[PDB]
Design a protein around this ligand. Sequence first.
Ligand SMILES: *[C@@H]1O[C@H](CO)[C@@H](O[C@@H]2O[C@H](CO)[C@@H](O[C@@H]3O[C@H](CO)[C@@H](O)[C@H](O)[C@@H]3O)[C@H](O)[C@H]2NC(C)=O)[C@H](O)[C@H]1NC(C)=O
Ligand SMILES: Nc1ncnc2c1ncn2[C@@H]1O[C@H](COP(=O)(O)OP(=O)(O)OP(=O)(O)O)[C@@H](O)[C@H]1O
Ligand SMILES: Nc1ncnc2c1ncn2[C@@H]1O[C@H](COP(=O)(O)OP(=O)(O)OP(=O)(O)O)[C@@H](O)[C@H]1O
Ligand SMILES: *[C@@H]1O[C@H](CO)[C@@H](O[C@@H]2O[C@H](CO)[C@@H](O)[C@H](O)[C@H]2NC(C)=O)[C@H](O)[C@H]1NC(C)=O
Ligand SMILES: *[C@@H]1O[C@H](CO)[C@@H](O)[C@H](O)[C@H]1NC(C)=O
Ligand SMILES: *[C@@H]1O[C@H](CO)[C@@H](O)[C@H](O)[C@H]1NC(C)=O
Ligand SMILES: *[C@@H]1O[C@H](CO)[C@@H](O)[C@H](O)[C@H]1NC(C)=O
Ligand SMILES: *[C@@H]1O[C@H](CO)[C@@H](O)[C@H](O)[C@H]1NC(C)=O
Ligand SMILES: *[C@@H]1O[C@H](CO)[C@@H](O)[C@H](O)[C@H]1NC(C)=O
Ligand SMILES: *[C@@H]1O[C@H](CO)[C@@H](O)[C@H](O)[C@H]1NC(C)=O
Ligand SMILES: [Mg+2]
Ligand SMILES: [Mg+2]
Length: 1687
Amino acid sequence: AFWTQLMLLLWKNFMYRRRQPVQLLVELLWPLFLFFILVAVRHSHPPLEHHECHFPNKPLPSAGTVPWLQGLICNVNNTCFPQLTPGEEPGRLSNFNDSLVSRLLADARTVLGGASAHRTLAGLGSLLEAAEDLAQELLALRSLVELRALLQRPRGTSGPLELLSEALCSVSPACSELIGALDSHPLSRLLWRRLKPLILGKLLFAPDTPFTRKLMAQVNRTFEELTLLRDVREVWEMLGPRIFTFMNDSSNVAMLQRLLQMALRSFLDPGSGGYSWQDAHADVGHLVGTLGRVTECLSLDKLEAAPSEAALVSRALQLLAEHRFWAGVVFLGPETPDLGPGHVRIKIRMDIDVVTRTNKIRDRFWDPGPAADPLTDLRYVWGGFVYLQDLVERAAVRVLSGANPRAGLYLQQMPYPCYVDDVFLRVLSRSLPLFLTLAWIYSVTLTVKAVVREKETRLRDTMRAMGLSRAVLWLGWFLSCLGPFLLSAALLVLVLKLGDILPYSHPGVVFLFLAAFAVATVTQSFLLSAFFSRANLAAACGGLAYFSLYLPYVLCVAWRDRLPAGGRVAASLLSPVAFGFGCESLALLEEQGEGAQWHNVGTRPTADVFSLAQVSGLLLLDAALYGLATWYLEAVCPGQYGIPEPSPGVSVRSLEKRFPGSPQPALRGLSLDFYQGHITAFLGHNGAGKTTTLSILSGLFPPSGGSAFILGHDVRSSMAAIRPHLGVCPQYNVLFDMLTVDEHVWFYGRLKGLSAAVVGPEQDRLLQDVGLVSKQSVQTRHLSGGMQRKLSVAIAFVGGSQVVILDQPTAGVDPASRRGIWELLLKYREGRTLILSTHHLDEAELLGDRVAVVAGGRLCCCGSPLFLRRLEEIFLKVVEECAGRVQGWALTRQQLQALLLKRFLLARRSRRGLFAQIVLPALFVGLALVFSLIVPPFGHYPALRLSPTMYGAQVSFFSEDAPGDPGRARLLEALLQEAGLEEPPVQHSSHRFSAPEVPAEVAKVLASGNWTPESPSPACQCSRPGARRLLPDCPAAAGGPPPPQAVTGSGEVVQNLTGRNLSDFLVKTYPRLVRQGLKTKKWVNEVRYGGFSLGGRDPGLPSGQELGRSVEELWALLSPLPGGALDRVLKNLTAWAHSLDAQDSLKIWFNNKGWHSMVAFVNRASNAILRAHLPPGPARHAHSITTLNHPLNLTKEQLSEGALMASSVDVLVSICVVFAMSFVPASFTLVLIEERVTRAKHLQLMGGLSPTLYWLGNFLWDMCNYLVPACIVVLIFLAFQQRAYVAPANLPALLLLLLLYGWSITPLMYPASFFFSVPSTAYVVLTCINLFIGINGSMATFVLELFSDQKLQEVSRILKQVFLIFPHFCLGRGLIDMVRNQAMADAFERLGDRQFQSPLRWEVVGKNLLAMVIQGPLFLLFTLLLQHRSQDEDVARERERVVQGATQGDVLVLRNLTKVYRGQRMPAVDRLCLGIPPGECFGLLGVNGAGKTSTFRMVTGDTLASRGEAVLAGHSVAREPSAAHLSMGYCPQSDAIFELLTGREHLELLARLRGVPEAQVAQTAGSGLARLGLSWYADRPAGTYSGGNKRKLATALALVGDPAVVFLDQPTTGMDPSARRFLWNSLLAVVREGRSVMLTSHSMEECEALCSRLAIMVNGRFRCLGSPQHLKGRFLEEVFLYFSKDQ
Ligand SMILES: *[C@@H]1O[C@H](CO)[C@@H](O[C@@H]2O[C@H](CO)[C@@H](O[C@@H]3O[C@H](CO)[C@@H](O)[C@H](O)[C@@H]3O)[C@H](O)[C@H]2NC(C)=O)[C@H](O)[C@H]1NC(C)=O
Ligand SMILES: Nc1ncnc2c1ncn2[C@@H]1O[C@H](COP(=O)(O)OP(=O)(O)OP(=O)(O)O)[C@@H](O)[C@H]1O
Ligand SMILES: Nc1ncnc2c1ncn2[C@@H]1O[C@H](COP(=O)(O)OP(=O)(O)OP(=O)(O)O)[C@@H](O)[C@H]1O
Ligand SMILES: *[C@@H]1O[C@H](CO)[C@@H](O[C@@H]2O[C@H](CO)[C@@H](O)[C@H](O)[C@H]2NC(C)=O)[C@H](O)[C@H]1NC(C)=O
Ligand SMILES: *[C@@H]1O[C@H](CO)[C@@H](O)[C@H](O)[C@H]1NC(C)=O
Ligand SMILES: *[C@@H]1O[C@H](CO)[C@@H](O)[C@H](O)[C@H]1NC(C)=O
Ligand SMILES: *[C@@H]1O[C@H](CO)[C@@H](O)[C@H](O)[C@H]1NC(C)=O
Ligand SMILES: *[C@@H]1O[C@H](CO)[C@@H](O)[C@H](O)[C@H]1NC(C)=O
Ligand SMILES: *[C@@H]1O[C@H](CO)[C@@H](O)[C@H](O)[C@H]1NC(C)=O
Ligand SMILES: *[C@@H]1O[C@H](CO)[C@@H](O)[C@H](O)[C@H]1NC(C)=O
Ligand SMILES: [Mg+2]
Ligand SMILES: [Mg+2]
């Protein structure tokens, strides 16, 4: 019956799914909200493609001084123009052109060279004519006019820097004052804030050898020449007064000058003196003063000294504090490459904030783009490393060679092709694993809760007792839970693929991966649900254990290096870790732009060696391991309801049971024997232990000793041969809520073993025999006690049961159905060994062929009924043989002191629950910090020698221009010999370069085209706009009409590239290397890293040398002063004029894709220059220069200025703490719901408690239980020294945040306690809702506010203020803003600006606090508002009297009461009128379906009415519920007690709440306990009583305190004759006192014989309403039946 049982289980699960569809829909739609938000954001963030653009030139200080400053000031940004920059042209050399300074210099050159001979002749002494001719062209130029216009600009704008940039580029206390004026504009302050160390620096060298002194003297030349401004200012200062005196009072000389004159504008220039003697003088004076201040800005004393390297490091550490460090050069002594001098080793040390990190030679991932960010990529330019290296290297070359080389190095970045990027893919790749792991948290918790709840209510054990096998049940659970997971995974795959989040991947492999993940999760949940045995405890520790298995993934991704593959494999056993590895592999495959379309299953040999074909096998292995572990754990440890762990049909011998809680054993020893087919009956007093014995016979409990045999087998050990031979009937019915009676019987009959053919007749026969045939399409949750009991006994009798045990077959059942019970028992008595147990003696004597009585755990006597006769009286004899008011505000003080005490007691018995509910979430945060704070230590950045030999094979350049010079040829051959290509011998003088062969098709295409090097040779390539398929441009074979002349060397290849355009070659060829390199797509072996270009064209006019002649022809005359100031300025003018001719350029093309690229090529260029200028000889290797790079020992890390917060450990810890604090405000509803459901809260509300006091007491207790997690969180943060969160500056913010979150979350979970029926489901649902609304709101807004800034910043600002109603959001954003502000403050402190903000601000945390405080108590007000939502002939004569007459004596008056069960056609209760006077024990009988309990619930106040009224002592229950509730007592059919408290606590609590004085509380409780026979069991917890004791306790809580009217419901459902005698005596006493009773039952005596006014009720209508003797006279069980048949 394996397949039949499987079909039955699947059908039942399908029926449950179909009955309630909303839960199915919400489960299927839960894990997609965050992905929906992500897709919505992505839809509005189109991919961006960048146009082609070329980068500009960058001169080095070796090329001069003016161009160096020009390139430093103008080219701050890497503004790349799409049009070709003039610098890239081989002929051109000066990118900056037609500017003010360049035009001024050129025009000055021209004017000075034009008439040098004329001024020489003038100085020889006509000359006036030559001077006039020169002055004629001194006005033709407009450069002087524009210079005057610029220097006359009114002062303002941003400062001198703006005018300096305008002049250079193309469209001392005073110095400090200028800086302070300039810093007001951050745009103008960019230059200062990037160039602070250049003005203030110190150059330090460790050795003090005179060789190093010569090196520094050679370095010092540029600083020496920079100070000519002081000398020229002094010269003008000396000339000032002299010319000022000469001009004044010299009219005679001037007039004789005009007399000797005898063009015209020159003659009129001295006229009136307005335009000659002051304007030009003032302008030149202002200019010289300005340059004097400029030269006084500099310190001019940059160099310093140091004894050794230790003193160097100490002085560096001292000087680093006050912004004075710019150097560190060390002339280390290798003595080493080889013997002999010239093997100098320069080792530059500089701060880590300025030099690129040397950890990585290249980048990490192939990101398409030139990577030319002028703020975080080109650090070597704005830092000054390259300038210092060039200066030191040129000085070393000058010292070693002894010559005067002239070769100005330049820098040029090659262009980059068109491309398109997807930033969103990289952004989401980091946070995908967290999203995916957090998506499936609903289903795991619900699965664990469902499993533990099914195993808790004995439903699983009862279902298994009839023949179910554990394997079948487990497989059914597996399939049923696995279904929705697979459907949801398929839907998620579909939505991911359709949304273009993962466009490349084929959905099949992704779906298989997700299905494997889902299977692993299912089996993990089934394993996790095997430790616990209580619904509350299992629900509490259900999400923490799942989410605590994901942190090791973070630990193992932080420790990526130094990790053996064995460790990764051993840490991949946990499912979330393996899924994280798989998700990372898939994300990196997607980012590579190659997809996973069924052929990428053995790829990725990198650090992420795992691909999406090895993780799935691991996941399946983990699922198998978890399943085996679950099976073993279930087999070895059953749980609370411990199943056994591997013709006298029934026999028990020496059977005893011992519960740990009870000091005395329940059972001592039994020897009872069972027989063939004689109905046996158990008789005994309450607490004898018949139900415990019956459970011991079944598999519910294990015996504490002895053994029990059934059908010759043994329930001990081998009980597997018992299942098809047993039938069970628990005292408390266990049934499926949704399934109806017909489905119940069909399911149990099929499971029992009946064939599919014999079902209908048997089921119908049993259903008719029992008496339930009138109802067949109603679910069991709409049935009263009697119908449920009849259904339970019917289910017990379904199928062929060899031995069946009946326990309380009838209870609350009228005799009419008891007759059907009798006939059912008689019809099956032939061999089925019927066993019975009831308190009714008539049934025992009528059926019992042998009666056995047990008392006090011992078999008193067993035998035939005739044996004992020689029945109620003798059984009772045997059992006997064996056995003012405090009123006012003071009362308000008392009530609370009771109520809170109750809570405290409920907290003392169950400490494990509190430990797991209000402590464990705090320790989860500590575990998160422990696992997220362990990082690998770092030491020092290693030193490396900078040369391109560390890259590998590559491609160089050879471009040359103007070959008609020997020096350029020598330098070029030096470059070739340095590259590695040795000089070929005489036989290969011209056999050096091997030109490859052009393809035939390309050759034909070029023949159809033009073979012109100075025209665009390559064909145009198509740009690809988005389209997600082709990122780079479309390649072609037309790039370069000749193939490059590749010549191999010792590992490198050098080409020719002479005469070609040289700009299109790289652009057209790069996409070929882009597409060719696909194996790794992270560290692709690019072949083009850099090259040279020897442009020998000199940007000097041929007349420039003439300038020097002019200067020297001014030196001989004018009496050169011996002081030397004039002499020295004239000789630095002559030197500048001579150097204006220059020698050549050595332009360097560098690729920024390789980090350490420009420095190595500068090194090689300088080494080649040295080898060129060296005299010929075999000492080529004897003299070599190497540049190192080693940052200081100062312990810091690379400051990522551009990279802001990017979903890091900070937000991880914030998510962890939010998760931990979301669980705590859910344990507060368990007790509330448990009280409301069992109708125990309403008892207290009857006691005299106003709802307001109840709610305030609960609120205070819940508040007192919230401060325990917060203290532990604060202590953990303090212990771990988390500066970001806890510190003497931000501690008040955290304290207020936690305290007010506690203040405002608690009164929000109260309204949810009205609409739930089982506590654990409410617990898990509220926990999941809190988790979702917190995380997926706050962290989603955080993701929105970062990364993309396309007005999504404005969208996030809009959404931020809206999410203030939820008190969960006020903890997420608050704990992220603090971290962000702390990070910004730390960055400012590291920078040195020393700016500190404030934690508590309006726009930081203040608004959240204010809003959450103001919304705090509104939820409590809503809670109270929702709580106060409710705003014959005798019968006819009685109705007429009630309608018209007004009996003031009567206490309770009913007026036409009726109410319908939400459309059940015939109203159960309708049109009732009655009047009761004081001091009459009213009674009311009926049948199972009359509606007695409905009448009690309608009149007592538990349910709201429909029509009519129920007035109780003046105040109506509906009009004023409080006044009616003031004085009455209740006892419902379903007993209302607390499982953990005891009886004495119950009585004392009710006594205190009613208002009795404190002194008499104990006396009243003792009297109440002793009155009803409850004393020997008045200290044990109320949860361990049996049915009779619980009934007695429930009755006792209805009479304590002497109320007015007692609304006793059926009180004798299971009480014993002694107990019922006690109850009758108590009722007689209370009615003698003068208080009425409204007992209703099916029994006799006080209900019937001692009653006062019976009233039979059938189908919601009264029948007689007459006295008992009156009923007997006019018309006792048979009399009642006759009267029922009378009408
Ligand atoms: C080396 O090859 C480059 C190709 O990149 C040549 O530059 C190209 O020069 C032509 C000159 O006509 C440019 O055409 C112009 O395009 C603009 C675009 O708006 C148009 O408005 C003009 O009317 C003109 O047609 C072309 O854009 C430009 N290519 C670029 C910038 O990528 C360069 O001249 C070659 N070197 C030589 C021939 O020495
Ligand atoms: N779970 C339990 N833990 C500890 N003691 C228990 C437990 N259940 C019952 N007992 C105790 O064991 C004894 C046997 O009483 P038991 O509950 O078995 O009676 P019963 O057969 O159900 O009787 P009744 O006919 O009155 O319903 C009592 O003292 C009872 O308090
Ligand atoms: N939840 C429900 N939904 C629909 N009908 C119900 C529901 N509960 C009870 N009924 C029906 O409404 C009527 C009211 O009966 P009620 O529940 O008051 O039982 P009772 O006969 O007074 O109790 P007892 O079973 O203890 O003798 C009955 O016909 C019953 O079958
Ligand atoms: C690289 O190619 C150029 C192509 O011009 C070579 O320069 C030519 O060299 C030959 C022989 O030396 C001369 O006859 C030509 O006159 C040169 N060209 C021009 C325009 O003058 C150059 O020699 C090649 N590189 C090397 C190292 O040989
Ligand atoms: C460089 O970029 C900054 C920042 O966008 C901008 O303000 C400035 O105008 C740009 N150009 C120059 C020459 O600084
Ligand atoms: C740019 O420089 C060249 C160099 O000779 C010069 O001829 C030209 O006038 C300058 N200005 C331009 C091209 O606008
Ligand atoms: C000479 O200087 C005096 C002031 O020092 C001035 O008043 C006078 O005008 C000057 N003379 C000439 C001719 O500039
Ligand atoms: C370097 O030049 C500066 C000029 O101010 C000065 O310290 C000195 O002349 C030189 N120092 C040397 C040669 O050590
Ligand atoms: C330039 O002038 C400075 C002093 O102003 C002098 O030290 C230096 O030697 C001069 N230049 C040359 C090449 O002599
Ligand atoms: C940095 O200084 C520490 C001082 O304890 C020393 O142990 C370490 O070796 C130094 N590192 C380097 C690279 O000099
Ligand atoms: Mg019992
Ligand atoms: Mg009832």
